Design a protein around this ligand. Structure first.
Ligand code: OGA
Ligand code: MG
Ligand code: NI
Ligand code: ZN
Length: 331
């Protein structure tokens, strides 16, 4: 079995190997990459996402989110307080202000220590989940707006045509902005490209061990767990690496830098934080191997998770027994 310790793997495809996206995902899996839940892909030196980032300041962040924490430094939840709209230029200035800017630090490990010590005492503002793309239309390789759609994959595997669309999303971050522990909708893959700015640190649990994280989470957030049998779908809970290690949960960590892709694999729980002002693009995708994970994915039906239009067909076709309860939670 390849990669039996479930380490995060880093790949360096050549320009020729960068042509066929599906083929390269399958190659990474042949080497055991999915066992980690997360892989890094460094593009060939000949590749670029677009020419420059000099002209992005007028993009609007209609609903910036202030991420307010509750709990203790290593075990906390966050809620999202909606703020007034602002442009990317305005948000960048805000990220760089004395109130929000990254502190002086020695290296990524020192900054990680500072994150986990001090995150809860601040409320950073995240420009997350903005429909759009920064890939040039002429970029033909690993262009996240030109991937095969998940509806097409389901139709190809299973023969049923379904409604829905699959488009990318932009994330504008600042120091301490946080993504809570989660797997993707319907335990899909995700791919994330860091277009510009400061790094993003990731934590990940191997898919074969995801239920160990779920059991810890129920212990640590007992009110939330009574509320909902799949409350990590709410995407509000944080648990630090120190707490994971104290509880024997298998995990890994890695830092993504500008110009690098990350892929998350089906049922790979992940969480993390931004180092300073940055912009990432991400989208969900599927392969043949995903279908079995989609059929078995948990679902939140308590009302909290609320999701896109396109999840309806995935539940309806892959999980008909659960569909009526899930859709009530949508309503
Ligand atoms: O970058 C973030 O805030 C969150 N990203 C992801 O969870 C992802 O790409 O799958
Ligand atoms: Mg602009
Ligand atoms: Ni994700
Ligand atoms: Zn729920």
């Amino acid at each position: 079995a390849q990669n039996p310790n479930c380490n995060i793997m880093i790949f360096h495809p050549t320009k020729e190997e960068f042509n066929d996206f599906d083929k390269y995902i399958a190659y990474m899996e042949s080497q055991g990459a999915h066992r980690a839940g997360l892989a890094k892909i460094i593009p060939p030196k000949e590749w670029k996402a677009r020419e420059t980032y000099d002209n992005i300041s007028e993009i609007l962040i209609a609903t910036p989110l202030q991420q307010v924490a509750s709990g203790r430094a290593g075990v906390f939840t966050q809620y999202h307080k909606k703020k007034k709209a602002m442009t990317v230029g305005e948000y960048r200035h805000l990220a760089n202000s004395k109130k929000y800017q990254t502190p002086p630090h020695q290296n990524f490990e020192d900054l990680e220590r500072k994150y986990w010590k001090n995150r809860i005492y601040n409320s950073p503002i995240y420009g997350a989940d903005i429909s759009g793309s920064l890939f040039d239309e002429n970029t033909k390789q690993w262009n996240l707006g030109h991937l095969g759609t998940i509806q097409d994959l389901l139709e190809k595997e299973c023969g049923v045509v379904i409604e829905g669309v699959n488009t990318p999303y932009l994330y504008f971050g600042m120091w301490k902005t946080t993504f809570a522990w989660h797997t993707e909708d319907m335990d899909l893959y995700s791919i994330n490209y860091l277009h510009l700015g400061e790094p993003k640190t990731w934590y990940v649990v191997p898919p074969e061990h995801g239920q160990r994280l779920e059991r810890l989470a129920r212990e640590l957030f007992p009110g939330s767990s009574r509320g909902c049998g799949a409350f990590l779908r709410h995407k509000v809970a944080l648990i630090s690496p120190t707490v994971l290690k104290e509880n024997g949960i298998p995990f890994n960590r890695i830092t993504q830098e500008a110009g690098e892709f990350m892929v998350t694999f089906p049922y790979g729980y992940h969480a993390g934080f931004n180092h300073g002002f940055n912009c990432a693009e991400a989208i969900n995708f599927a392969t043949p191997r995903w279908i079995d994970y989609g059929k078995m994915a948990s679902q939140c039906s308590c009302g909290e998770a609320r999701v896109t239009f396109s999840m309806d067909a995935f539940v309806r076709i892959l999980q008909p027994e659960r569909y009526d309860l899930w859709k009530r939670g949508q309503d």
